[PDB]
Design a protein around this nucleic acid. Structure first.
Lengths: 50, 121, 50, 51
RNA sequence: GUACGUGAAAUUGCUGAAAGGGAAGCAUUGGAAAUCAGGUCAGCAUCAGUUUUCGGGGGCGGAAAAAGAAUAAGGGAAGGUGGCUGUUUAUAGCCCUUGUUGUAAUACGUCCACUGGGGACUGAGGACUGCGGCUUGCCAAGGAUGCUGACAUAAUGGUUUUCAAUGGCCCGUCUUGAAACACGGACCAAGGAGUCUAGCAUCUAUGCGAGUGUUUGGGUGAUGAAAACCCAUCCGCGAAAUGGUGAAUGCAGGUGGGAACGCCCUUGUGGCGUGCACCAUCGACCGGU
RNA sequence: CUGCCGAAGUUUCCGGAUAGCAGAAACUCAGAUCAGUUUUAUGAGUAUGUAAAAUGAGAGUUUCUAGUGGGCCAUUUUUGGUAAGCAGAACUGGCGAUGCGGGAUGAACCGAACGUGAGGUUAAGGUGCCGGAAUGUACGCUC
RNA sequence: UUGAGAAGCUCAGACGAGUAGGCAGGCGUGGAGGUUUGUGACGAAGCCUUGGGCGUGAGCCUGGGUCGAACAGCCUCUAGU
């Protein structure tokens, strides 16, 4: 479990760094890098049952 | 586990105060327009099972003992093993002579008596 | 995602709202999919795994 | 079992139970070390400061 | 004390206590006064749960903030300064671009399994199990303990009356989508409305079971004999149907699913055998079996 | 006296049955089917109907036995209109069986749906005083 | 570990308006059979009470007073409840 958690956290950091480098290179090149479209959504119900 | 009471007031019947012919004993209002039945603003409360008390402390006196009605000495000996759970309560129709026998025997068994001083003094 | 599962995370076990208080609860209910701990459950939700 | 729910985000002992990895995390890390390479395309700056 | 057992309520007089500025009753929370039961009530600490409120430190992100400052180029001018209304840094300066100081800082966004305080509420459970941490043990790790006080000639918890603040439309009946009308209600006590019986049906229980049902009657019953106990002959319903006749062809028939059981071996699964009830299927036998 | 479950509020045929909604009894079914839902595909006219992934939930029948068969209000489409009202449908909503916060007060407005409590935080509406909460901050308009 | 009134004990989660309707468990009253070595003139029943206690409730128990001859718990039966 410790090794899996270490792998997952390293994956999160690598993905965050990768997205930031990808944006920086496009900005330096003058090009546009679209981010990945989110796969996960969190939905909160704000209105009651009436 | 102290004795906790969810409520101390009784549940008086609606309009029992205005009319003497209407006793204070709780009666479920059957009128389909009874404002108190509908639980409007400021209305008096109605008995609910949620008002029920903790099963562990239910039926227990403030001292933590449950009252057990006792008619003669034989009932007192029945409380030999439950003196930390039960308190003897001498019946109203038990005469003065039997009360002194009940109280004295209860003292020997170490059993609390709820009304030990009645008709005995 | 991590704070929701740690603080407000409850699992449906035997149709019962059992809190995610131990890793064995998640392992017993999601070990068939190799989700052994809370961090594995967080990883599956966050990355939207299979 | 589990008479009371303890929050790992507040109870360190419960977090250690759930995650046998939090003891070695090191959240704060020098990543922008050495020098900061200002990376801003001149084309990008022109369109940004355009109109 | 015959206005005679017990002596309720409505209601009345009296005394006591209290309230009262065009209603009252009531509910909630406490105060006061009176009165009851008779361990109680506090302060702090260390923790657990929920929560609120202040800070500190540090990552990362964006124009890898924008500025800005300091310092080198060039450009432009003004809401024109010194100078002389007009002009171009001089005896004020400003704007634009670039370099530099730079990896500047800061703000904002985000993160810390980073951290320091203040406040409130809660303490369920009740030998030991478990998951963990530090090292047999110890622990903030499957729910509060520890250290003291004070006080019982009172505090707490009540109860009664009353006040304060807040809320509170008269009950039932009827009508309508719904109200409101409208009808009943001066007050109290006592009485006062789904009952017994015959039939039918359902369901449950009980006894027996191809049977079943003693109580028309008889026998019998000394202690209440209208009970209980016993049962000859009949009869009721059922066991045979169909419109006079009147039923295993075929383990009282095969196929599939199926309760339950058995044997197995990839053993679990799945295979094979047996297969109640019940339901679809081919089949019969009597005028339903 | 307390507790639990809990409608219909109306089709479809001649006041009755059928069905619907609610329960009970007895079955089979979890390598299964459902859904007041959305996608995908097919055609056909932004919608339609038909079929086949997402999400959720264990999903099915049989018997038999209660109660119900109204209305009111509102939106939208549409049919006509008329000094102007409105009149006629359809549509699903809200009430109806239901308290509570707010709207000074209220059958139809805004929130919200109910065991007994302690704490925390909000919705709608609010923060001069009555009245709990800023005689707050910033920019205007108005006599 | 004693916690088998198995009709008992224990663990866990969810839920809580409610008319018509459906279902369940309880409180109380007169009388009957059984039972409590039951209560009682040293005071039954009843009544009264700003006494106490129990139950969500129907209701129950008890102190004090008055009172003067009978009454109750439990299990079942019954109803002019």
């Amino acid at each position: 479990i410790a090794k899996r958690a270490e792998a997952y956290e390293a994956e999160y950091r690598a993905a965050e760094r990768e997205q930031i480098e990808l944006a920086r290179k496009a900005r330096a090149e003058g090009n546009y890098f679209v981010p990945h479209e989110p796969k996960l959504i969190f939905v909160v119900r704000i209105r009651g049952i009436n | 586990v102290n004795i906790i009471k969810k409520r101390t007031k009784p549940f008086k019947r609606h309009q029992s105060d205005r009319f003497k012919r209407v006793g204070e004993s709780w009666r479920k209002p059957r009128g389909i327009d009874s404002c108190v039945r509908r639980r409007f603003r400021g209305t008096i409360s109605m008995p609910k099972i949620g008002y029920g008390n903790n099963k562990k402390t239910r039926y227990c006196m403030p001292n933590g003992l449950k009252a057990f009605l006792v008619r003669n000495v034989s009932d007192v000996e029945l409380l030999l093993m439950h003196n930390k759970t039960y308190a003897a309560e001498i019946a109203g129709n038990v005469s003065a002579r039997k009360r002194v026998e009940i109280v004295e025997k209860a003292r020997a068994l170490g059993v609390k008596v709820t009304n030990a001083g009645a008709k005995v003094r | 995602v991590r704070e929701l599962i740690y603080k407000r995370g409850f699992g449906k076990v035997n149709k019962q709202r059992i809190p995610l208080s131990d890793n064995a609860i998640i392992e017993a209910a999601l070990g068939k999919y190799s989700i052994l701990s809370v961090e594995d459950l967080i990883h599956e939700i966050y990355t939207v795994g299979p | 079992a589990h008479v009371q729910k303890k929050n790992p985000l507040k109870n360190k002992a419960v977090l250690s139970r759930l995650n046998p990895y939090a003891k070695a995390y090191k959240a704060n890390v020098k990543i922008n070390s050495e020098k900061t390479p200002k990376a801003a395309g001149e084309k990008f700056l022109s369109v940004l400061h355009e109109n």
